[PDB]
Amino acid sequence: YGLVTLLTAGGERIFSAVAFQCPCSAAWNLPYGLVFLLVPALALFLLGYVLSARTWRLLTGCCRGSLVCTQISAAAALAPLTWVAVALLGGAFYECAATGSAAFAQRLCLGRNRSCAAELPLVPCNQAKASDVQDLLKDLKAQSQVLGWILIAVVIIILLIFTSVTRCLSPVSFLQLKFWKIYLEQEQQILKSKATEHATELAKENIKCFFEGSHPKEYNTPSMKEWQQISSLYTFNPKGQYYSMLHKYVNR
Amino acid sequence: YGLVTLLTAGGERIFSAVAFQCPCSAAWNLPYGLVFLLVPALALFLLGYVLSARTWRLLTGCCRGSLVCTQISAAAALAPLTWVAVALLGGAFYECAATGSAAFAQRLCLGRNRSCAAELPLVPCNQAKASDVQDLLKDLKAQSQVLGWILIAVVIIILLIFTSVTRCLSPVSFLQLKFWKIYLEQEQQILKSKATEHATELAKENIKCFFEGSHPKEYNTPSMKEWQQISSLYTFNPKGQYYSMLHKYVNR
Amino acid sequence: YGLVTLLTAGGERIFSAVAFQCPCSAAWNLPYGLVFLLVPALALFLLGYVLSARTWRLLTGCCRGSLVCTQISAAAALAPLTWVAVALLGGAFYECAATGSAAFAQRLCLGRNRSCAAELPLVPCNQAKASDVQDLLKDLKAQSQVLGWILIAVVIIILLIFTSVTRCLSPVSFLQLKFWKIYLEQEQQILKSKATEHATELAKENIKCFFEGSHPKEYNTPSMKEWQQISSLYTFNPKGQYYSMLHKYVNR
Amino acid sequence: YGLVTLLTAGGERIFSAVAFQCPCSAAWNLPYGLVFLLVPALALFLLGYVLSARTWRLLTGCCRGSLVCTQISAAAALAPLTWVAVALLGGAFYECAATGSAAFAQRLCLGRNRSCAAELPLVPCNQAKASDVQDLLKDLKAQSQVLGWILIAVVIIILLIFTSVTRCLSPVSFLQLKFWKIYLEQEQQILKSKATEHATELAKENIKCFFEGSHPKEYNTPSMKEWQQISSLYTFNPKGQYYSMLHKYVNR
Amino acid sequence: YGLVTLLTAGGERIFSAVAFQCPCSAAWNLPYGLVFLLVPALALFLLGYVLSARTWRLLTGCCRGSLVCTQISAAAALAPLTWVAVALLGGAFYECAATGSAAFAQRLCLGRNRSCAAELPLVPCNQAKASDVQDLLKDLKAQSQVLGWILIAVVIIILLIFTSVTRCLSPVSFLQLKFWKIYLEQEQQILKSKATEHATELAKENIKCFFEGSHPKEYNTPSMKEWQQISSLYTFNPKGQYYSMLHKYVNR
Amino acid sequence: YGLVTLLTAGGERIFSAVAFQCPCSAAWNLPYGLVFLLVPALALFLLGYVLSARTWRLLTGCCRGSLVCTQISAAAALAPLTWVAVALLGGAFYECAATGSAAFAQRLCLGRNRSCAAELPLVPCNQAKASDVQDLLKDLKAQSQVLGWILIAVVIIILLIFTSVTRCLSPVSFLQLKFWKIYLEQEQQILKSKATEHATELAKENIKCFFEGSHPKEYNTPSMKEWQQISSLYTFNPKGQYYSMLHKYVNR
Amino acid sequence: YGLVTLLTAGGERIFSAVAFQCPCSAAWNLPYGLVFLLVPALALFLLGYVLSARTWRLLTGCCRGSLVCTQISAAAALAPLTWVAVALLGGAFYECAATGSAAFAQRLCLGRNRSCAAELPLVPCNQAKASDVQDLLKDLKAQSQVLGWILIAVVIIILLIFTSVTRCLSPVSFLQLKFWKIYLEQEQQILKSKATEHATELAKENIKCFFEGSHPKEYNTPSMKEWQQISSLYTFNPKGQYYSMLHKYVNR
Amino acid sequence: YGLVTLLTAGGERIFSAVAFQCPCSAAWNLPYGLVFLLVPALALFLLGYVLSARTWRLLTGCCRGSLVCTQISAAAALAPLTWVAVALLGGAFYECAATGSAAFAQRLCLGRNRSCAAELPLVPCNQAKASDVQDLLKDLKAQSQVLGWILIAVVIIILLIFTSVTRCLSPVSFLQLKFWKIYLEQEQQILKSKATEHATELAKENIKCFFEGSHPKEYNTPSMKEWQQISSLYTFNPKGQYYSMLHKYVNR
């Protein structure tokens, strides 16, 4: 129960701390909204850019490259766009971003109170009492939510076009591509299991030879150059089907 | 319990954020309603346009085509129409769409207050106090719900006509069409299972040959050109019944 | 629990949205009631017209016909009449339909307030304060419920006459008709099961021949023309009892 | 139940005691915030600097060294930065750090009340009633949260660059590095188990010889110089793959 | 349930009795705080100084000695420092220690009320009403908590330096030291078990000889001088590895 | 449930009866506090002096003796000191003991009201309204709690010195003393069991001889003089290790 | 549930009836307290004097005797003293016994109101309003509780001295006395069991002989004079150890 | 559940009906208390006088006799005395018996109001308002409870003397008397069982002979004169031990 209690206490403290006041300030407010917009989005973007093993496969070993790079970048930027869309649909962040540069304010307000730019930042702060801005905060909330929805539409549209073109111009058919992906999945799982047990037997043999203090068996050597040879990325040629470059490397 | 708590917290935050205020604004309100109408509808339409594997079957491989295209487009536009119908029956969105172009307003209001177009947008906002518009908001809600019901009738009618004609002019009978669909289902499931285990054995053999470092077996080759040959779409000719083009490709 | 919570939230939202206000409007109210009367009724009528496989049996294959058509139409119009009866017994819809054409109003009200047609639509809206109409709304509710009960009587009467005549003039006896229906039920279930397993074996054989890449077995061919031949509808002649046209087609 | 009750009582007492008042004091407040910033951060930094066995491996035995040292220092400073980021996002600590050196105050306040530096420390204390500082506390809270978010961005960026470069310039490939780490894991677990049972048998033999009072068996001797020889750190040379220096020491 | 009820009643009585009032007294208050500071700390220090069996091993038998003594003293003073740190972070004790010697008071208060030393002791007592001291109590609470945090930092720093130096200059490597500690653990457990059963058999034999009234067996004698010989402490020499002096005493 | 209900009722009655009012009386109050101090302490002291079987071993049989006597007296006075310490830390008892002899009062009060000794006993009674004594009761509570803490420190210190010296000057080593105590424990348990079954067989034989009415078996006689011989206390001589005097008595 | 309900109802009625009002009466109150003091104490004393089988062993058979008589009397008066101590610590009874003989009152009250003896009995009755006695009731409660505690100390002291002397001058040692008591326990249990089954077989034989109507077996006769012979009490002589007089009677 | 509900309803009705009002009446009240005193006591006395089978053993058969009669009468009057003691300790009954004969009243009241006998019966009725009797009711309650306690002491004393004398002058010893009572218990249980099965076999034989309609077996006859012979009561003579007169009747 200790873990449960500590986790609930930590979560409550965390959320009470992420309380979003949108401080009404003449000039220090814009960055307040801007960081709450960009930084968590950038964070999730980075985590996506990190997590996928496909890019790591390319990166290791002392560092056409455009296609794979834009593919991985989009496949990772999927999620941060979802976060920023959800936040922008939250409305609070952009509502705080209302002020921004003075150009936005001067172009923005209808000029009714003639005192917009002076103490506009008070408008999400609810401290200003001019009727014009008390209605204008609502319109700004609207612009935030609307922009968010427009973004979540643009992102799905881009995903459509991306996946469709990537699915349109490939030489291989569909019912084989599905089977190929199943193949790669099975290969990954089999590799995990058998490499695990092979490393296990290697360790067992070596540690027994250490306790005894004698020569090892010298059963076989997984060649490191071979490892690099099978780490190739592209895995296609119309003639030599040979998926999974390891499999391509069975002729010699 | 952590997943459960995080999911309920996220759902509550999400729904509190999708709170729909319908900001009363002279000109920025129309798009507010318009995005809440179109964008989620377009989203679900796109997801339908993506999900079905029948269209993907046509799309892959470097891209009569009308019939299949309108069939898939309608079969996917089924759901977005359901969303937009439910929303329009919600009444709030179109109620916010009341203003729209000025032509709608000038033609719309009875001319009683003579001040409609000035601050009509306040009518779902409940801030306007003219009796005429306080009753007119109700009629607009009515028009929304009624239009929604009319749409959900038109959509079912269209579905009827579509499925009836598609069921009327086909050469094959009913009790055979049912059996054929059962056939295709069984074929899909069998294909999934056996292709899975065949890829499994392929991977096993190749990974064993890799650990040993020797020549593979060369059992057999699923031909890629054969894969493309069996990916055909139409699957009918009165003479050569031969469902499931794979099955058609058993004579040679 | 996620499915349960989402379903209850959706149901609550749906029902809160189907809230029926009956907007009091001089001319736009009649259609408000009319759609809530007809459209859900038409919807359930259409779903009935779709669901029964007996009509589909007739429809497929490039399209005396009166008897079967009126039979299926009544057997499907059973349910929509139940919906419209329940709704009309609800009273709200027709109460909203009070206004209708002006002829209904002028003939309807006793002429007491002499101001009926002007703002009668307010009478279910409870905003009108003339004593005559405040009592007249009740009578309209009465007319709605009464008409509903009259309809639910007429529908059961029609069902009686229909099923009795259909049960009266048939040549076959009762205790055999029951057995015949049991027969058709058993035939349907047996057909489902055995056709399922036969398609299963067909698929197995063909997919094995594909993995191997060799000629199929050519066990037998369910003839498509035979399928159409056994799809006939009438299934009766006094001499050749031969229920279930498939069974009739065993002499040659 | 005694342990549970004592733990909940202790936790409640602990948290009630860590109550953070931010005493408003002219000069003794700055250190109040500074210790609550640095000391828990330094504590978690130290615990990280202690816990990892990789550094201990280097440290023991009477004490190129730069690379490993910066690697371990960053890998341990990961967590304290997370603590300080969470705290700075809490806002209270830095809000208490508002005062700091007088330079911060004189540069900070807009000069409105002209009495900032006199009793500014009261501003998180809520005792000062000047409007300027009552709004300025909010901006200070903002600066705290914003700086926190900037730090949590900088830390993830640094983690990215660190892990990417460390993953970029290594000679070995990826799919082999994963296998190598699995290898080291298996080696650690096998070592734990077998060393455990070997020490067990050693102890059993010696304690039996003690109860009897006779000469021991002298089965074998794990050489201490050998232990030191196998404690090496680098474990790489392009030619002699020989992971896990113990494994490198199997040729002689 | 009796034990449970008596324990909860005793705990409630105990805690209600340890209620800390900090009596405001001119001269008798300082010791009030001082005992609540030192005595529980000294108590836990003593319990640590008692509990560890390593020191007892040295102490028994009619009583270089510096190194082991400072090691055990620090290893035992670990916990009392934790208690005193937690208490000092509680703030109440030192807040009561505010008064102390008059030098602390005269140097302490800003000289505002000019009546500090007269009735300062009332300041945690909340009975004094001078504004200066009502704010000064807060600063004293601050000094308490801050000093506590400084102490909990100094203690962890000292622990770091201690364990690092003790881990730095030892001749044996790490991966062998871990194994050695595992060895000593296994030896302790084996000793417990086998000594237990050996004493059991000894007692059985002697008590049987008593019931019968005859001569004992005289199986063997665990020599007391041998016991003292195997009780040695240092257990290291670079040449004769021979951990666990018992094990060192197997050559003769 | 009857036992449970009677026990809870008895406990509630008991505790409601041990309600401590500290009657404010000029001369009869001192003994009121004194008995509540000494008598329960003396009671637990006596129970300790009774319970230990080591002293009984010395006492029986018609009654160097200093060492064992002070050892047992301290080992039994352990607990009463804990009771009196807990009570004195309760504060109420000594607070009632405030009055005591007049010397304590005259030396005690600052002489402010000049009416201390007259009606000081009212000070824990809360009936006196002089400000001096209303503050003095608090200081007396302080003196009680402080004295209690001083006592609980002195007792642990004495326990330390006692157990350390007793552990310091003994000739036998530690790791043998532990084994010896385990030995005595096992001997006690074995003695309990086997003496039990031997008395059981004795009783069985004699009662069978009684039912039959014949001569007994005369198997053996546990000699009473032997019993006294094996009841000796010291159990040590450097030469004849011979723990557990019974065991010492196996040579003849 | 009937037994449970009747028992709780009876207990509630019983306790509501034992409500102790201490009627304030000039002369009839003293006996009111005196009976509530003595009678339940005498009752429990008598029950103790009855229950122990050791005295019954002496009493039966037509009735040095001092030692056993004082031993049994003290061993039985143990409990009544506990009851009277608990009651006297309750305070109510003796508080009611305040009045007693007039000598107690005249010596008791300080002579302040000069009207003590007239209506002192009202003092626990709370009806008298003289300040002196309203404080004097408290002192009387004190005297009651204090006397109770003094008694519970005297009783434990007496128990100590009694059991110590009885344990001091006995000729037999301790470790044999424990074994002897275990012996007597086992003898009692064995006697219970075997006498039970022997009476069972006797009854079986006789009742079978009755149903048949024939001569009995005449197996054996437990001699009544033998029964009396084995009922002796002292069970000790230094020479003939022979515990449990039955066992002493095995020589002839 | 029906039995449970009916029992609780009956119990509630019964107890609500046994509500004891003690009607304040000048002359009809005395019997009100007297019946509530004697009648339930007499009832339980009678039930005791009935239940014991020892007296029935004497009574049957056409009706020294003093000793057994007083023994049974006391053994049965045990319980009614307990009831009357509990009731008298209840106080209400005797409080109602306050009035009694006028002699009790005239001797009873102090003569203060000079109006005792007129409307004294109102004193437990709480309707009289004279201070003297409002205090006198309390004293009467006291006399009731005290008399009850005196009675419960006298009864236990009498039980003591009775059982002691009956245990003192008997010729047989204790340890044989216990065995004898065990014997009689076993004899009763064996008699129950075997007589049961013997009557069972008798009935079986006779009812079989009835169904068949033939002569019975005539196995044996339990003689009625024998039954009377074995029903004797005294069961003792010093010479012929022969407990359980049935057992005495085994010589002839």
Tab-separated table of all heavy atoms in Angstrom, chain C residues 3-32:
chain	number	residue	atom	x	y	z
C	3	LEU	N	-15.124	0.530	-21.652
C	3	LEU	CA	-16.277	0.401	-22.536
C	3	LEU	C	-17.557	0.780	-21.803
C	3	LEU	O	-18.405	1.498	-22.343
C	3	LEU	CB	-16.357	-1.025	-23.085
C	3	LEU	CG	-17.534	-1.404	-23.985
C	3	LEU	CD1	-17.050	-2.228	-25.167
C	3	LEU	CD2	-18.587	-2.174	-23.202
C	4	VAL	N	-17.707	0.300	-20.566
C	4	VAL	CA	-18.905	0.580	-19.776
C	4	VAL	C	-19.054	2.079	-19.551
C	4	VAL	O	-20.137	2.652	-19.737
C	4	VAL	CB	-18.857	-0.187	-18.444
C	4	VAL	CG1	-20.096	0.110	-17.615
C	4	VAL	CG2	-18.720	-1.682	-18.697
C	5	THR	N	-17.963	2.734	-19.142
C	5	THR	CA	-18.022	4.162	-18.849
C	5	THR	C	-18.309	4.963	-20.110
C	5	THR	O	-19.112	5.906	-20.088
C	5	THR	CB	-16.712	4.618	-18.208
C	5	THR	OG1	-16.526	3.936	-16.962
C	5	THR	CG2	-16.731	6.118	-17.959
C	6	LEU	N	-17.675	4.599	-21.224
C	6	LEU	CA	-17.922	5.331	-22.457
C	6	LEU	C	-19.360	5.139	-22.915
C	6	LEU	O	-19.992	6.085	-23.398
C	6	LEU	CB	-16.939	4.891	-23.543
C	6	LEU	CG	-15.625	5.672	-23.655
C	6	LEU	CD1	-15.911	7.112	-24.048
C	6	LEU	CD2	-14.816	5.627	-22.367
C	7	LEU	N	-19.903	3.929	-22.756
C	7	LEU	CA	-21.282	3.691	-23.161
C	7	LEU	C	-22.270	4.468	-22.301
C	7	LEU	O	-23.226	5.046	-22.829
C	7	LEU	CB	-21.598	2.196	-23.104
C	7	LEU	CG	-22.954	1.786	-23.685
C	7	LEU	CD1	-23.205	2.467	-25.024
C	7	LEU	CD2	-23.054	0.275	-23.820
C	8	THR	N	-22.073	4.497	-20.977
C	8	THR	CA	-23.005	5.266	-20.153
C	8	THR	C	-22.894	6.760	-20.442
C	8	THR	O	-23.914	7.462	-20.495
C	8	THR	CB	-22.811	4.983	-18.659
C	8	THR	OG1	-23.577	5.925	-17.895
C	8	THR	CG2	-21.371	5.104	-18.248
C	9	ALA	N	-21.671	7.265	-20.646
C	9	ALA	CA	-21.514	8.678	-20.979
C	9	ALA	C	-22.183	9.000	-22.308
C	9	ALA	O	-22.877	10.020	-22.437
C	9	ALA	CB	-20.031	9.047	-21.018
C	10	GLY	N	-22.009	8.125	-23.301
C	10	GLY	CA	-22.633	8.347	-24.589
C	10	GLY	C	-24.143	8.312	-24.500
C	10	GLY	O	-24.825	9.126	-25.116
C	11	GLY	N	-24.686	7.359	-23.738
C	11	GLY	CA	-26.129	7.287	-23.587
C	11	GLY	C	-26.693	8.520	-22.911
C	11	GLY	O	-27.718	9.059	-23.336
C	12	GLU	N	-26.029	8.990	-21.852
C	12	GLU	CA	-26.514	10.185	-21.170
C	12	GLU	C	-26.473	11.388	-22.098
C	12	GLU	O	-27.426	12.174	-22.151
C	12	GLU	CB	-25.699	10.451	-19.908
C	12	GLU	CG	-26.338	11.486	-19.008
C	12	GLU	CD	-27.795	11.182	-18.726
C	12	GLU	OE1	-28.119	10.010	-18.438
C	12	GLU	OE2	-28.622	12.114	-18.804
C	13	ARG	N	-25.378	11.541	-22.844
C	13	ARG	CA	-25.271	12.643	-23.794
C	13	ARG	C	-26.361	12.539	-24.856
C	13	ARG	O	-27.018	13.534	-25.189
C	13	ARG	CB	-23.865	12.639	-24.397
C	13	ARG	CG	-23.538	13.728	-25.399
C	13	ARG	CD	-22.087	13.557	-25.842
C	13	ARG	NE	-21.651	14.554	-26.814
C	13	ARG	CZ	-21.818	14.439	-28.126
C	13	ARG	NH1	-22.410	13.365	-28.628
C	13	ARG	NH2	-21.387	15.396	-28.938
C	14	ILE	N	-26.582	11.329	-25.375
C	14	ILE	CA	-27.566	11.103	-26.429
C	14	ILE	C	-28.952	11.497	-25.941
C	14	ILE	O	-29.677	12.238	-26.610
C	14	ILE	CB	-27.529	9.637	-26.896
C	14	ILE	CG1	-26.344	9.404	-27.835
C	14	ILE	CG2	-28.840	9.255	-27.567
C	14	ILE	CD1	-26.336	8.035	-28.481
C	15	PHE	N	-29.308	11.065	-24.734
C	15	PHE	CA	-30.660	11.302	-24.245
C	15	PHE	C	-30.837	12.762	-23.866
C	15	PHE	O	-31.900	13.342	-24.106
C	15	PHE	CB	-30.978	10.384	-23.064
C	15	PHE	CG	-31.329	8.977	-23.464
C	15	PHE	CD1	-30.397	8.150	-24.064
C	15	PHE	CD2	-32.603	8.481	-23.234
C	15	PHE	CE1	-30.724	6.858	-24.429
C	15	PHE	CE2	-32.937	7.191	-23.597
C	15	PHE	CZ	-31.997	6.378	-24.195
C	16	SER	N	-29.808	13.375	-23.278
C	16	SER	CA	-29.887	14.798	-22.986
C	16	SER	C	-30.033	15.592	-24.277
C	16	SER	O	-30.622	16.679	-24.278
C	16	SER	CB	-28.644	15.243	-22.218
C	16	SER	OG	-28.773	14.962	-20.835
C	17	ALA	N	-29.508	15.059	-25.383
C	17	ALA	CA	-29.593	15.737	-26.670
C	17	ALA	C	-30.937	15.518	-27.358
C	17	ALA	O	-31.372	16.377	-28.132
C	17	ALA	CB	-28.458	15.271	-27.584
C	18	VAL	N	-31.608	14.394	-27.099
C	18	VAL	CA	-32.896	14.114	-27.729
C	18	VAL	C	-33.994	14.779	-26.902
C	18	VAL	O	-35.188	14.530	-27.103
C	18	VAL	CB	-33.124	12.593	-27.876
C	18	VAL	CG1	-34.384	12.273	-28.680
C	18	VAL	CG2	-31.939	11.945	-28.553
C	19	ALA	N	-33.594	15.628	-25.957
C	19	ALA	CA	-34.557	16.439	-25.226
C	19	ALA	C	-35.512	17.131	-26.190
C	19	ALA	O	-35.091	17.729	-27.182
C	19	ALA	CB	-33.828	17.473	-24.369
C	20	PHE	N	-36.800	17.036	-25.899
C	20	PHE	CA	-37.848	17.454	-26.822
C	20	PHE	C	-38.497	18.711	-26.262
C	20	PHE	O	-39.292	18.640	-25.320
C	20	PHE	CB	-38.861	16.334	-27.003
C	20	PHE	CG	-39.867	16.596	-28.071
C	20	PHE	CD1	-39.661	16.145	-29.360
C	20	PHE	CD2	-41.033	17.282	-27.782
C	20	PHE	CE1	-40.597	16.379	-30.342
C	20	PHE	CE2	-41.970	17.521	-28.760
C	20	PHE	CZ	-41.754	17.066	-30.042
C	21	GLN	N	-38.168	19.864	-26.836
C	21	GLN	CA	-38.706	21.109	-26.309
C	21	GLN	C	-40.014	21.535	-26.954
C	21	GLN	O	-40.747	22.326	-26.352
C	21	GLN	CB	-37.691	22.238	-26.483
C	21	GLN	CG	-36.728	22.392	-25.325
C	21	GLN	CD	-36.070	23.757	-25.306
C	21	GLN	OE1	-36.222	24.545	-26.239
C	21	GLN	NE2	-35.335	24.046	-24.237
C	22	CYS	N	-40.331	21.019	-28.139
C	22	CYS	CA	-41.467	21.496	-28.920
C	22	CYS	C	-41.437	23.017	-29.015
C	22	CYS	O	-42.224	23.696	-28.343
C	22	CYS	CB	-42.798	21.026	-28.333
C	22	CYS	SG	-44.246	21.565	-29.299
C	23	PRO	N	-40.525	23.583	-29.797
C	23	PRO	CA	-40.438	25.045	-29.900
C	23	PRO	C	-41.761	25.642	-30.348
C	23	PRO	O	-42.312	25.263	-31.384
C	23	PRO	CB	-39.339	25.260	-30.944
C	23	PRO	CG	-39.265	23.965	-31.675
C	23	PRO	CD	-39.539	22.922	-30.658
C	24	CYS	N	-42.264	26.592	-29.570
C	24	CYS	CA	-43.503	27.266	-29.933
C	24	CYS	C	-43.188	28.287	-31.017
C	24	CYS	O	-42.603	29.339	-30.743
C	24	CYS	CB	-44.161	27.924	-28.721
C	24	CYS	SG	-43.130	28.893	-27.575
C	25	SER	N	-43.571	27.972	-32.251
C	25	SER	CA	-43.343	28.846	-33.391
C	25	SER	C	-44.588	28.826	-34.259
C	25	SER	O	-45.280	27.809	-34.355
C	25	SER	CB	-42.119	28.419	-34.212
C	25	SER	OG	-42.278	27.105	-34.720
C	26	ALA	N	-44.860	29.964	-34.901
C	26	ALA	CA	-46.103	30.113	-35.649
C	26	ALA	C	-46.176	29.150	-36.826
C	26	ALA	O	-47.233	28.568	-37.093
C	26	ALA	CB	-46.251	31.555	-36.131
C	27	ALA	N	-45.071	28.968	-37.540
C	27	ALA	CA	-45.086	28.164	-38.752
C	27	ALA	C	-44.026	27.082	-38.797
C	27	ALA	O	-44.214	26.098	-39.521
C	27	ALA	CB	-44.923	29.057	-39.991
C	28	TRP	N	-42.937	27.213	-38.056
C	28	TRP	CA	-41.868	26.234	-38.124
C	28	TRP	C	-42.057	25.080	-37.149
C	28	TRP	O	-41.186	24.209	-37.062
C	28	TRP	CB	-40.534	26.919	-37.863
C	28	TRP	CG	-39.400	26.114	-38.329
C	28	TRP	CD1	-38.485	25.466	-37.565
C	28	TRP	CD2	-39.034	25.881	-39.690
C	28	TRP	NE1	-37.580	24.818	-38.365
C	28	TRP	CE2	-37.889	25.065	-39.677
C	28	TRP	CE3	-39.565	26.280	-40.918
C	28	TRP	CZ2	-37.263	24.639	-40.845
C	28	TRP	CZ3	-38.945	25.856	-42.077
C	28	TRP	CH2	-37.806	25.045	-42.032
C	29	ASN	N	-43.178	25.033	-36.436
C	29	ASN	CA	-43.404	24.038	-35.395
C	29	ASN	C	-43.996	22.760	-35.975
C	29	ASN	O	-43.667	21.651	-35.527
C	29	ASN	CB	-44.311	24.619	-34.311
C	29	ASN	CG	-44.565	23.649	-33.185
C	29	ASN	OD1	-45.314	22.690	-33.337
C	29	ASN	ND2	-43.940	23.895	-32.040
C	30	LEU	N	-44.902	22.912	-36.934
C	30	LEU	CA	-45.593	21.800	-37.564
C	30	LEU	C	-44.531	20.828	-38.066
C	30	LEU	O	-44.598	19.641	-37.726
C	30	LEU	CB	-46.514	22.266	-38.691
C	30	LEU	CG	-46.806	21.189	-39.734
C	30	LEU	CD1	-47.648	20.073	-39.132
C	30	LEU	CD2	-47.495	21.793	-40.946
C	31	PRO	N	-43.561	21.257	-38.887
C	31	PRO	CA	-42.547	20.294	-39.333
C	31	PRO	C	-41.759	19.722	-38.174
C	31	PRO	O	-41.312	18.575	-38.258
C	31	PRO	CB	-41.657	21.122	-40.269
C	31	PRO	CG	-42.473	22.306	-40.634
C	31	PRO	CD	-43.276	22.600	-39.422
C	32	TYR	N	-41.574	20.492	-37.097
C	32	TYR	CA	-40.865	19.974	-35.929
C	32	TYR	C	-41.547	18.721	-35.415
C	32	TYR	O	-40.899	17.701	-35.156
C	32	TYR	CB	-40.791	21.029	-34.824
C	32	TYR	CG	-40.048	20.572	-33.577
C	32	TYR	CD1	-38.668	20.679	-33.472
C	32	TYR	CD2	-40.742	20.031	-32.503
C	32	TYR	CE1	-38.001	20.259	-32.325
C	32	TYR	CE2	-40.087	19.607	-31.364
C	32	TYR	CZ	-38.721	19.723	-31.274
C	32	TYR	OH	-38.084	19.300	-30.128
